[PDB]
Amino acid sequence: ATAVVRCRTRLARRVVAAVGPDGLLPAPCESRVLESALALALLTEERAEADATARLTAYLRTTLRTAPPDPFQCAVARAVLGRKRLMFRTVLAALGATGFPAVPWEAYDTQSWLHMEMKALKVLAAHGTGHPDVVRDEDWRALLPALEPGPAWECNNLAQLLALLALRHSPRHRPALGDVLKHVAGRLRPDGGMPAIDGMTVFTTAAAGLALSLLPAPPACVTPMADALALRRNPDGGYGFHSGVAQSDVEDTCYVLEFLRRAAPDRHRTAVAEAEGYLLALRNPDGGFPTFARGTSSEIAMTAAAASALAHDPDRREEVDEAVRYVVRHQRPDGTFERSWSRNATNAVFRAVLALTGVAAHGEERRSRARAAERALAHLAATQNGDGGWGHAEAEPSDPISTAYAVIALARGPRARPGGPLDRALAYLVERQHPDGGYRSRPDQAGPRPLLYDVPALADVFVLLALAHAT
């Protein structure tokens, strides 16, 4: 057929091959400078795990020299080798690089993940400013999961590392420190670094399952993939980003729900209904959806994702319509929406356009939604790079993941024409395919925002999702 279909075919073979017999696509996270630096600081202060601290030191020096991250992580690394503003400043102050914020202690009180990180930073600031008496027993109590053996609580190495840097100041918690330092030291990757998270296999398996389910003839492996996801659902009916993550989130749950609706709607009928229930219980009064917890602010990409995921059930048409109306209201004067968990402009455009064009609509609302979708697709056309791709921002060089999101959106516009934006984007993706069938991309996932972390398995998965939508 076409060079695009040949590309799609080679990539689908690669993704299918990567799925294991347990139904999961492995999705390890690369080493990250922030967690590596905090681990070095911790092990160094405790005079522990000499072999690991030397590997961490060499990892940080190499990375700073060859592939330096953002300026904040660079400053963290240099400090150890030699609300977000509150958190990041307090991290640097704990490492001796700047002064502690002169804020009331209540400034630190607040994710269950963010809550633990901010309590740990509160303790570090109390001790660092010479006021250890300020720390209350409820502050220490929040940190107790960091003393449990095994992988980090919620697969979150930042939260455990900060908690342990705080807890090593408390005499009544130190008996438990030795054992957990051994398992922290045991997490180093082959390059000597500490990954941000244990992995992202639930998110990655769900997105890949969805992409495979959009192919003309989905592979047999979608069934064990669907099985592997459904048996990992949390009690509230939602999904976390990796095995062992108790805090469900809207983004993971929408990808799982979208996948199960296509590949296993009867086999996994109860998980499907529980995932819809999870989303509906989170819905905010304004018709939007938060990321984790009701009462926190609606977000555009989460609202669009939930609109599309719920649209399958005609019984939910009223909540879907209110979510799409929310998307229309929040479009910016230049046709864009607003980032978040992705650091590129194209992620929220792709979610918004799918919501604006999937939910069938007629009359005035059809015209309102069509105008919004056109402005967003026009923003993509206006910002497309000369090589046919998109970057993280309008003046950034193209990358396959940012381009994949734009392709998914453009596949909802008018048909590709020779030399048009969608045609040129697909040619860009065809040209970036590696001999082994895969894609390498700058990562787009952030957390804590805006700090990037790198799960390389996602590049293949999102490019396949784009090619499955566009063909």
Ligand X SMILES: CC(C)=CCC/C(C)=C\CC/C(C)=C\COP(=O)(O)OP(=O)(O)O
Please report, as ranges, the residues that interact with ligand X according to CB under 6 A.
111, 113-114, 156, 196-197, 203, 241, 249, 251-252, 341, 445, 447-449
Helix (H, G, I), strand (E, B) or coil at 419: coil
With respect to ligand X, which residue has the nearer C-beta, 45 or 70? 70
CB of 141 to ligand X, least distance (A): 20
Q: What residues between 397 and 426 interact with Mg ion by CB under 5 A?
A: none
CB of 172 to Mg ion, least distance (A): 26
With respect to Mg ion, which residue has the nearer C-beta, 148 or 321? 148
Per rule CB under 5 A, is residue 158 in the interface with Mg ion? yes
With respect to Mg ion, which residue has the nearer C-beta, 114 or 427? 114
Query: Alpha-carbon distance 128 to 95, whole Å?
Result: 10
Question: Cβ(446)–Cβ(193) under 8 Å?
Answer: no
* Residue nearest to Mg ion as judged by C-beta position: 448
Given Mg ion, ligand X, none, residue 366, with its beta carbon under 5 to 8 Å by kind, binds none
Per rule CB under 5 A, is residue 376 in the interface with Mg ion? no
- Helix (H) / strand (E) element for 160: namely helix 157-167
CB of 445 to ligand X, least distance (A): 6
Question: Cβ(430)–Cβ(403) under 8 Å?
Answer: no
Per rule CB under 5 A, is residue 155 in the interface with Mg ion? no
CA atoms within 13 A on the CB side of 252: 25
With respect to ligand X, which residue has the nearer C-beta, 100 or 203? 203
Question: Cβ(374)–Cβ(328) under 8 Å?
Answer: no
Question: Cβ(344)–Cβ(393) under 8 Å?
Answer: yes
CB of 427 to ligand X, least distance (A): 28
The span from the first CA to the last CA of the chain, in angstroms, equals: 11
User: What token pair was written down for 142?
Assistant: 């929040």
CB of 253 to ligand X, least distance (A): 9
* Residue nearest to ligand X as judged by C-beta position: 447
Per rule CB under 5 A, is residue 290 in the interface with Mg ion? no
Given Mg ion, ligand X, none, residue 251, with its beta carbon under 5 to 8 Å by kind, binds ligand X
Per rule CB under 5 A, is residue 446 in the interface with Mg ion? no
CB of 282 to ligand X, least distance (A): 14
C-alpha torsion 312→313→316→318, nearest 10? 60
CB of 457 to ligand X, least distance (A): 13
Q: Count CB-CB contacts under 10 A for residue 232.
A: 21
Query: Alpha-carbon distance 95 to 79, whole Å?
Result: 6
With respect to Mg ion, which residue has the nearer C-beta, 114 or 378? 114
With respect to Mg ion, which residue has the nearer C-beta, 91 or 353? 91
With respect to ligand X, which residue has the nearer C-beta, 388 or 443? 443
CA angle at 245 for the pair 244 and 246, rounded to the nearest 5°: 110
Per rule CB under 5 A, is residue 114 in the interface with Mg ion? yes
User: What token pair was written down for 456?
Assistant: 């390389």
With respect to Mg ion, which residue has the nearer C-beta, 147 or 158? 158
Among 199, 288, 391, 448, binds Mg ion (CB under 5 A): 448
CB of 247 to ligand X, least distance (A): 7
Question: Cβ(200)–Cβ(27) under 8 Å?
Answer: yes
With respect to ligand X, which residue has the nearer C-beta, 181 or 197? 197
Query: Alpha-carbon distance 167 to 159, whole Å?
Result: 12
Interface with Mg ion (CB under 5 A), residue total 4
CB of 348 to ligand X, least distance (A): 12
Where helices occur in 46-155 by DSSP H, the ranges are 50-66, 71-81, 84-94, 112-128, 137-141
Nearest partner of 470 among 432, 422, 420, judged by Cα: 422
User: Interface residues with Mg ion (CB under 5 A)?
Assistant: 113-114, 158, 448
